Each structure stands twice: as C-alpha cells, then as structure tokens.
C-alpha cells in the first residue's frame, strides 16, 4: 500500500514497486501564485502539460569510490523541452518540482543513498579565499559531484542534512525515492538563469557492495516541474 506508487503528470507516468513513501517538503504541495502575493502585473503563461511533466536526466554510475552527485534547479532543466523554451523566452519563472530518484540492484547488493533537496545550497570552495565561479556552480543537465560530501561542500555537516526534505534509498529496502518540492524563494518569482532555489543531492553514505558477479548500477533522476508559470515575455536568451 505504501511500497507501490504511480506518478502521472502530463504525458508522462512512472511506476515503482519498491517505494517507502514519498516526502512533501515541509508538508507543502506546489501551487500557482495567488493574487494577494503576485508582483508582476502582466498575465502569466501557464503551459500546464507542456512543461509539468517528467524529464529524465542522464544516468550516473554508482561506483565504489563515488562521493555523490548533485543537480541544481531550475538550472538542470533550463535547456530541456518546452520548460527550457519557456525559461529562455521569459524573464521570470515560478514552479515546484516532483523528484523521483531510481536505483535498483539485487538482494545480494547493499548500499544506502541519502536523497536530500537542499534549499539555497550555496556552495563553498575548498582551501581558498576565492568564491566559486560561474562554471563551478552552473553545470546544467549533467550536474556535478561532491568534492567533500562529509561537509556538504559548504563547511556544514552531512550528518545534519536530514533537517532538509529527504528520503533514503536503502538497497535492501527500496529502489526509489520521491520528493515533492514547493516553490522555495524569498521572492514570488525569480530569474531562472541566475538563481537556483533547490539542489538535489544524492550521497552514498553506505558504499555499494556485493560478492556476486558485478554489474553496472546506475542512478537515474526524473524531475517534473509542477505549476509552472512564466512572466515577462521577450526574445530567447538562453
């Protein structure tokens, strides 16, 4: 009853038979911007199924020495499908996200992945006074990897990352994690090309292990924007 789940958005659907539950960040659900909170006065465009659908990013391989992976939103989706086109043609965007992380192995495999959505994951640089550059932060669809997951690449602690909305993929228990993210920002809308509201981090707290014949064990991320709206139409910028 809580291990099987189907998510359907637009023309996309996902089914998992080894879920635990799914997390609604801070007990909230995505919604459109209400009139009593709006700032931009132009009529927003709400593409609905054109943008509110699952986009699957490139899979990554879970290796023995893997330190972890991250993707910044909306940066990771800014060049994908109609969501990317709307982002490129509009000065302002707003949306939640539905995140589904997939990783399966055998009953002889072991490992634990922490799947956490970090709001405003401002990254720090290691052993230097220079702030991270644009190329260090904006990785797009490919995402990045943690240099020091122990401190979340920001001088904090991985052990306390559970304060953020998160699930675990414990191979003996489940093969997928689902997190629903509301709009998380100090402003009602934002410029999607210069600010990232959420960071999805997947960190192998317990390394992948087995004594059976080894196989590639990928981790796959599917993200569906929810309640997308865009304001300030102009020419494409990207």
């Amino acid at each position: 009853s809580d291990r099987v789940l189907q998510l359907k958005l637009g023309n996309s659907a996902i089914v998992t038979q080894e879920a635990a539950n799914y997390c609604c960040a801070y007990g909230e659900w995505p919604n459109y911007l209400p009139d009593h909170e709006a700032v931009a006065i132009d009529k927003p465009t709400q593409p609905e199924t054109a943008t509110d659908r699952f986009y699957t990013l490139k899979s990554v391989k879970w290796e023995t020495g893997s330190t972890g992976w991250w993707w910044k939103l909306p940066d990771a989706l800014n060049n994908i499908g109609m969501f990317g086109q709307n982002v490129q043609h509009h000065y302002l965007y707003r949306s939640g996200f539905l995140i589904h992380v997939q990783c399966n192995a055998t009953k002889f495999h072991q490992g634990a992945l922490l799947v956490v959505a970090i709001p405003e994951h401002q990254r720090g640089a290691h052993n230097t006074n220079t702030s991270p550059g644009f190329d260090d932060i904006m990785k797009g669809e490919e995402g990045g990897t943690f240099n020091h997951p122990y401190v979340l690449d920001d001088g904090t602690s991985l052990a306390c990352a559970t304060i953020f909305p998160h699930q675990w993929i414990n191979l003996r228990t489940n093969n997928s994690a689902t997190i629903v993210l509301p709009w998380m920002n100090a402003a009602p809308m934002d410029f999607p090309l210069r600010h990232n509201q959420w960071t999805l981090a997947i960190i192998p707290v317990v390394p992948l292990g087995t004594r059976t014949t080894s196989s590639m064990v990928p981790i796959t991320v599917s993200i569906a924007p929810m309640c997308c709206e865009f304001n300030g139409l102009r020419h494409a910028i990207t």
Binding site: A20, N21, C23, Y26, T173, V180
Partner: protein
C-alpha cells in the same frame, strides 16, 4: 512602553508558542500510525 509612531520600533515579541514539528519530523504524504509497521 512604546511611544514611537512606527510599529517596528517596539520591543521584542516572545509570545509566539505555536509549533508544528511535523513539518520536519514527518513530511510524508501518508501519515504513520503508532505501533503499525511503517513499511
């Protein structure tokens, strides 16, 4: 004692005892019941 005209000049407000820890301790769509297995 606040004789200033601007409300933000007032002293601190230490009377908001409202709590909702479930936002961080139980942010799951399906609420869990006591004793019953979670999975």
């Amino acid at each position: 004692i606040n004789f200033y005209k601007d409300s933000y000049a007032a002293s601190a407000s230490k009377q908001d005892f409202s709590q909702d820890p479930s936002k961080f301790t139980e942010p799951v769509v399906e609420g869990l019941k006591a004793g019953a297995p979670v999975l």
